[PDB]
Design a protein around this ligand. Structure first.
Ligand SMILES: CC(=O)N[C@H]1[C@H](O[C@@H]2[C@@H](O)[C@H](O)O[C@H](CO)[C@@H]2O)O[C@H](CO)[C@@H](O[C@@H]2O[C@H](CO[C@]3(C(=O)O)C[C@H](O)[C@@H](NC(C)=O)[C@H]([C@H](O)[C@H](O)CO)O3)[C@H](O)[C@H](O)[C@H]2O)[C@@H]1O
Ligand SMILES: CC(=O)N[C@H]1[C@H](O[C@@H]2[C@@H](O)[C@H](O)O[C@H](CO)[C@@H]2O)O[C@H](CO)[C@@H](O[C@@H]2O[C@H](CO[C@]3(C(=O)O)C[C@H](O)[C@@H](NC(C)=O)[C@H]([C@H](O)[C@H](O)CO)O3)[C@H](O)[C@H](O)[C@H]2O)[C@@H]1O
Ligand SMILES: CC(=O)N[C@H]1[C@H](O[C@@H]2[C@@H](O)[C@H](O)O[C@H](CO)[C@@H]2O)O[C@H](CO)[C@@H](O[C@@H]2O[C@H](CO[C@]3(C(=O)O)C[C@H](O)[C@@H](NC(C)=O)[C@H]([C@H](O)[C@H](O)CO)O3)[C@H](O)[C@H](O)[C@H]2O)[C@@H]1O
Ligand SMILES: *[C@@H]1O[C@H](CO)[C@@H](O)[C@H](O)[C@H]1NC(C)=O
Ligand SMILES: *[C@@H]1O[C@H](CO)[C@@H](O)[C@H](O)[C@H]1NC(C)=O
Ligand SMILES: *[C@@H]1O[C@H](CO)[C@@H](O)[C@H](O)[C@H]1NC(C)=O
Ligand SMILES: *[C@@H]1O[C@H](CO)[C@@H](O)[C@H](O)[C@H]1NC(C)=O
Ligand SMILES: *[C@@H]1O[C@H](CO)[C@@H](O)[C@H](O)[C@H]1NC(C)=O
Ligand SMILES: *[C@@H]1O[C@H](CO)[C@@H](O)[C@H](O)[C@H]1NC(C)=O
Ligand SMILES: *[C@@H]1O[C@H](CO)[C@@H](O)[C@H](O)[C@H]1NC(C)=O
Ligand SMILES: *[C@@H]1O[C@H](CO)[C@@H](O)[C@H](O)[C@H]1NC(C)=O
Ligand SMILES: *[C@@H]1O[C@H](CO)[C@@H](O)[C@H](O)[C@H]1NC(C)=O
Ligand SMILES: *[C@@H]1O[C@H](CO)[C@@H](O)[C@H](O)[C@H]1NC(C)=O
Ligand SMILES: *[C@@H]1O[C@H](CO)[C@@H](O)[C@H](O)[C@H]1NC(C)=O
Lengths: 492, 489, 488
């Protein structure tokens, strides 16, 4: 009669990496890293994003004639923008604090356009002016959200405008100043030289003077237009005053919804699909804690890491046993007939052979491994990860600072995850061997000298053991005093 | 005769966490997180703070009439300010590089006010101007540290003033420029239009022109005042020149003491107490690696982690149940002398004991373990706090992301370290008990008989001296050889 | 006849650290931190650096008469500069966006010079101005790369100038505006009051007005000069216009080579040596992952930490024996392996060693060391950044970021080394005990354990017997009858 102790082996080919060995075959493994995406841009939470196409943020807000599809925009989840948009500032010029405006637009999910200074109120000036830089059907045109004030007759009276924010929320207002190319243009358009543009609110005070000089021609013009913005608070007034070179606003943008969003730089188009996490390459439909698709992401998303594989070993080592002899134990290798658990027995008494499994040790090890996996997974913080920021070309030091901070944090977390996986894999691999040896030691200690240790994990008895005795050994209820006299006689 | 190997147990309730099992009761434990405070604002190292009250830093430095108790201020440790103070710039306006000034004030612990430009030297101008936005008992007043210069008669001559820094340290000087509401105010205050204000030092050059326009009324006035500042070095000179719209300084703030300080944003009042670490909610009296009270602390304080529990297992696992059994059946609730030990049952009488060697080495190892976890933590002075304007949102976001990421890194590090360390400690105790059992078996050989419950049943009658020998490591197998062999057969 | 299981011991005095114990003597150890350096400033990859000496970047780029040796600088790898250079802006003034220029200079490597506005083109102005601040051999002089335009006779016509960037790469252009001290100076130099200087490119639009005021005297002058720069793109044009107070450029700086470079603040001189990693204190010749010389480095350089010691245990504990086995201590006679045996039969005694266990342990330790070393990424880092007096918050932010990352890495390295040392020292004991258990399991009941790690045989075990026991092919049935007879 025999009784042996061993573990479970199968035909799995999965491999894991530990700290002292690489490419170790395991029975079961878990992948906590996702590397796949659908390669499409979709709807977030059911709300489609805003597709700017070839337009830019400045072109959308100012009202470029090539951006007439965005004159009435519904609620959005994120903004899609190209790297180098073609239709932006049709009239050559600049845009002060552009990056700050783009950053503000990363927490706004809806705008409401309100007419604050109607065009017909300028009854002492000329409001129908344009340029061939922004041309519709050949004839010159202008921005659809701004008014160009020129002289009426042969005089330019002082232009005064005001607006009291009785809308209900913060309002965004944009104005501009025109810089001519020669004194001829200035005297043809505004009738006087030495003009000023003054804009004032409760917490704002600005006075700009036009610059007239010969400049290189961009879009066929040697002139420029400088744009500035402000955020008017509730129950607050904005005052405009100018002697010349004022590009007045007709519309003001009211922040109607607020939340978390961002600007995604991509060259693709939207497709009919839904998702909960959006990368510039495609959506992610996952429950795993990590991914390595793209750093920048919008929505609740797994952490990024510069890794190619991260596998957690949740099973035993796969060492298979290699003439109608006696089945060995855990010393030689695993068993392929034990399919009901991880650790078990094998009896060879008179009433047939057969395998079995020990439920207590298997349950304990399963609970421990599940707890380890859940501790690794669930001690990671997940939130909104809008990590897109823009910097001008006078802000190289700030851009380098942001790049270094992001790279350092990403490298730190990569190191953390990789080393954690390595140590945990080694610890679980040693755990399984410790458990098997502990079960063997318990069996030997409870069986005492009634048996004969064979040296390969098996126990040759000294008495005749029935299935009742075998289950007693498995149950840990073996009655040593009962068989003492019988076993002692056959020993010598 | 019987000898057994076991471990000590008690009636504890403290629970630790292990990466494999949660809620494991332990005999001893060490909490390395502090979660309490006194809820009061106290004195840092015996020096009281500067309680601004309803005043702002601009109001304190400019001389707001409602902050007359701050004209002379002693040495301080930190500044207490409200989130939205009331008495700031009584005259509506702005302040250039306000956040830079507030950051500079974070390393200054005392100021000395020096009269650098008296009011009586302006003998060619009028220096009694005032406004009703800054009013005392109904009549108009003005800032106490500044002079408003106005025409004397019907003339405003060119105003010139210079100062040489012979005080002995760096000096802070604040001036201002007035922006009227209409040309009428400009002409009845300064007699001419097209004025300038020029300030020049060895490393500074600034020229400003007033802006006259209609603005929404704040505090009743459509005018504004714009203030600037500079840091004058030792043995350096500052020049002032203006044809109008100049608010000249009367006093300068010399930096008398330097060090580490900060601005704490609270709404409370100072009380009578001492401390070493201060938080906006209260003071901390602790000597532990970690705390979870408030992020923005002033002083040498433990790192902040978003953890509600961080307990290091120092003692053994608590299995209460134990003739008498050994370590397989569980722990002993009667061995109150040490950690590992024995239990003998010879004919003289039963009794417990303790193994001094194993207990001492385990104690030293656990002590070194705890001290390595604790004394690897840099704790220097850091007054975490910075202010940004409404046009510096990107910088504010960068700073917030930096602090949040560092905090998350440190919480993950601490939690993982505690979990793995506790697992290793419990495994260490189990291994030590097993090693003691194995050593006893190895030295005791076949003269005894294992029972499977951790105990050994001898074959020779063993007295007290023999038992102290087997606990000593000086057991003599050959002497009990023939006697032991006889009865075993 | 005996066979024993033991481990190696020697006369080393190395010491490692562990999470449970400190000052542990080991047979073999590896130091993974380098604390030594050459002490000299060398050539990076065979290319010598740029030695500014007593000059500043502004002085080099403007043409300070004292810096007359840097008019034709060759290719370089990094720039050496002093903390407080002496020869800089000889004429007192400022330099707008100076730190941005210094940041841009950390990625260029040659800076070819191109004459864009030759001085002879100004036929309607006087171009021979100078000052005693920048005085050579007593007589007044001026910057060698700049032109000071004054009036000719009693007129100052409008000054215009253009340059189309057809060089083949980006260019750097610097101009200036002069601020006088009084109206007498302004009328003596430019003949008109109320002047302006206008500069315009396809993406720049700046207009400046002179400031006339009395200022403290620096270098004997109460007047100042303000300098600004721009980066002209390819096939772009820059326009200059002024009615006075213009310091026009004569040269432009075309970027010829781009790559990784930097600025080092040192007070030393270049010495004849070659290196690949350079610190402000010296050079590093290394094969080790770590170093604790100086935070700021240029080149292929190791990682930096606040660590005074980082030693990885690659061997056994040194517990020499005062023939016993592994219970007492190591053997000072086993010179061919980590774990081994010692036997004594009627041929003779002698030590030996195991091959499989020693090889497995060697491979495991080597893999551990290589994993610790090779998971640390390295790359070129431009740590050095400079900030102005009104950017204290940004400077503090940068300092806090660098310090925090560096303490994080220091803590990680320390904990990794401590836990790995504990793991190795437990691994060795586990391996020796596993060998002992394997031998006992194979040898069964035909022998007699003696407690110290040795086995006393019950039969007469010869040399072929002993190699069989070492091999793992011990025949239990062959000696079963003989062993059982004498045991009874
Ligand atoms: C309205 C118009 O066509 N003006 C042109 C100007 O005309 C003079 C007219 O005002 C006067 O009464 O009579 C004389 C003849 O006796 C002229 O006809 O003449 C200029 C040259 O002589 C033209 O200059 C050219 O303008 C180009 C630009 O056209 C646009 C543009 O595409 O930007 C469009 C409009 O003409 C105009 N917008 C208005 C008036 O509201 C803008 C305007 O010039 C902006 O200030 C841009 O600079 O220009 C090119 O700029 C070209 O380089 C220039 O020679 C006038 O178009
Ligand atoms: C000094 C004074 O009372 N000025 C008031 C001004 O009167 C003139 C006086 O200077 C002249 O000699 O004679 C005429 C009569 O022939 C006046 O009496 O009249 C203004 C109305 O027309 C008042 O304006 C109002 O001022 C308000 C603010 O008043 C104060 C203030 O408390 O801020 C009063 C101060 O005395 C005055 N002067 C100084 C030197 O600080 C300041 C000054 O105007 C500031 O510079 C304000 O920018 O103003 C309100 O602003 C109100 O809206 C306005 O109508 C003059 O008070
Ligand atoms: C060219 C010259 O010698 N100018 C000095 C000036 O003289 C006049 C001359 O131009 C006119 O035709 O005739 C009168 C007599 O009828 C004068 O001879 O007189 C000034 C004092 O009265 C001197 O002033 C001093 O200049 C110092 C600086 O000298 C330099 C310098 O080294 O920086 C000399 C340069 O030649 C001069 N000119 C140019 C074109 O660079 C510069 C120039 O003044 C700078 O722009 C200064 O902002 O200055 C000191 O500045 C000292 O404080 C001052 O009194 C003139 O040197
Ligand atoms: C482990 O596998 C990887 C890829 O499967 C291979 O590159 C590497 O050489 C393997 N390791 C060894 C020790 O062969
Ligand atoms: C703006 O409107 C609100 C509400 O109608 C009013 O209280 C406030 O006085 C108005 N502003 C001004 C400057 O009158
Ligand atoms: C996305 O994942 C969910 C699991 O929550 C699954 O039910 C659904 O079918 C998946 N959709 C696609 C398109 O893969
Ligand atoms: C551990 O105990 C806490 C209460 O002390 C309980 O909230 C938690 O669910 C328990 N966890 C487990 C795994 O039993
Ligand atoms: C300021 O005072 C110091 C010492 O009294 C003196 O050396 C210096 O020349 C003075 N400054 C000026 C501009 O005279
Ligand atoms: C135990 O060992 C110590 C060795 O220092 C010895 O002095 C003592 O007598 C021993 N005890 C007994 C009972 O032999
Ligand atoms: C240690 O032993 C080696 C033998 O290889 C010898 O060369 C060396 O000098 C010895 N060192 C000391 C300090 O005894
Ligand atoms: C123990 O280690 C410390 C370094 O932490 C060292 O200064 C000291 O000399 C060492 N002592 C011994 C006895 O090795
Ligand atoms: C500058 O030169 C380029 C040559 O490629 C030419 O295309 C361009 O028109 C020139 N610029 C101007 C303003 O003519
Ligand atoms: C640098 O170290 C290497 C060893 O890795 C050595 O071969 C070489 O000669 C050394 N060079 C110098 C200049 O020290
Ligand atoms: C030991 O094993 C080797 C296997 O490489 C074999 O060649 C040799 O004959 C064996 N020796 C004995 C004595 O079994």
């Amino acid at each position: 009669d025999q009784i042996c102790i061993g573990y479970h082996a199968n035909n799995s080919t999965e491999t894991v990496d530990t700290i002292l060995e690489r490419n170790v075959t395991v029975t079961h493994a878990k992948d906590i890293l996702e590397k796949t995406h659908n390669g499409k841009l979709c709807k977030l939470n059911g709300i489609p994003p805003l597709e700017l196409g070839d337009c830019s943020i400045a072109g959308w807000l100012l009202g470029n004639p090539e951006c007439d599809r965005l004159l009435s925009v519904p609620e959005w989840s994120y903004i899609m923008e190209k790297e180098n948009p073609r239709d932006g500032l049709c009239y050559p010029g600049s845009f002060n604090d552009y990056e700050e405006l783009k950053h503000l637009l990363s927490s706004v999910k809806h705008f409401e356009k309100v007419k604050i200074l109607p065009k017909d109120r300028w009854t002492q000036h000329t409001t129908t002016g344009g340029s061939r830089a922004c041309a519709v059907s050949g004839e010159p045109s202008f921005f659809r959200n701004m008014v160009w004030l020129t002289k009426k007759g042969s005089n330019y009276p002082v232009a005064k405008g005001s607006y009291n924010n009785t809308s209900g929320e913060q309002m965004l207002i944009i104005w501009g100043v025109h810089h001519p190319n020669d004194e001829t243009e200035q005297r043809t358009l505004y009738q006087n030289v030495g003009t000023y543009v003054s804009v004032g609110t409760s917490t704002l005070n600005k006075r700009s003077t036009p610059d007239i000089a010969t400049r290189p021609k961009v879009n066929g013009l040697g002139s420029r237009m400088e744009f500035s913005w402000t955020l008017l608070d509730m129950w607050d007034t904005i005052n405009f005053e100018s002697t010349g070179n004022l590009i007045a606003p007709e519309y003001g943008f009211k922040i109607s919804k607020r939340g978390s969003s961002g600007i995604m730089k991509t060259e693709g188009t939207l497709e009919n699909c839904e998702t909960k996490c959006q990368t510039p390459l495609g959506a992610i439909n996952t429950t795993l804690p990590f991914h390595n698709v793209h750093p920048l992401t919008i929505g609740e998303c797994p952490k990024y890491v510069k890794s190619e594989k991260l596998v957690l070993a949740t099973g035993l080592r796969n060492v298979p046993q290699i003439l109608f002899g006696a089945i060995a134990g855990f010393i030689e290798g695993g068993w392929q007939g034990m399919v009901d658990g991880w650790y078990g027995y094998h009896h060879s008494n008179d009433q047939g052979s057969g395998y079995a499994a020990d439920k207590e040790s298997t349950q304990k090890a399963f609970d421990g491994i599940t707890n380890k996996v859940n501790s690794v997974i669930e001690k990671m913080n997940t939130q909104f990860e809008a990590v897109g920021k823009e910097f001008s070309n006078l802000e190289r030091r700030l851009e380098n600072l942001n790049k270094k901070m992001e790279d350092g944090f990403l490298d730190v977390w990569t190191y953390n995850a990789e080393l954690l996986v390595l140590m945990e894999n080694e610890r679980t691999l040693d755990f399984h061997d410790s458990n098997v040896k502990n079960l063997y030691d318990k069996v030997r200690m409870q069986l005492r000298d009634n048996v004969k240790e064979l040296g390969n994990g098996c126990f040759e008895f000294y008495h005749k053991c029935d299935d009742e005795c075998m289950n007693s050994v498995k149950n840990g209820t073996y009655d040593y005093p009962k068989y003492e006299e019988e076993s002692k006689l056959n020993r010598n």
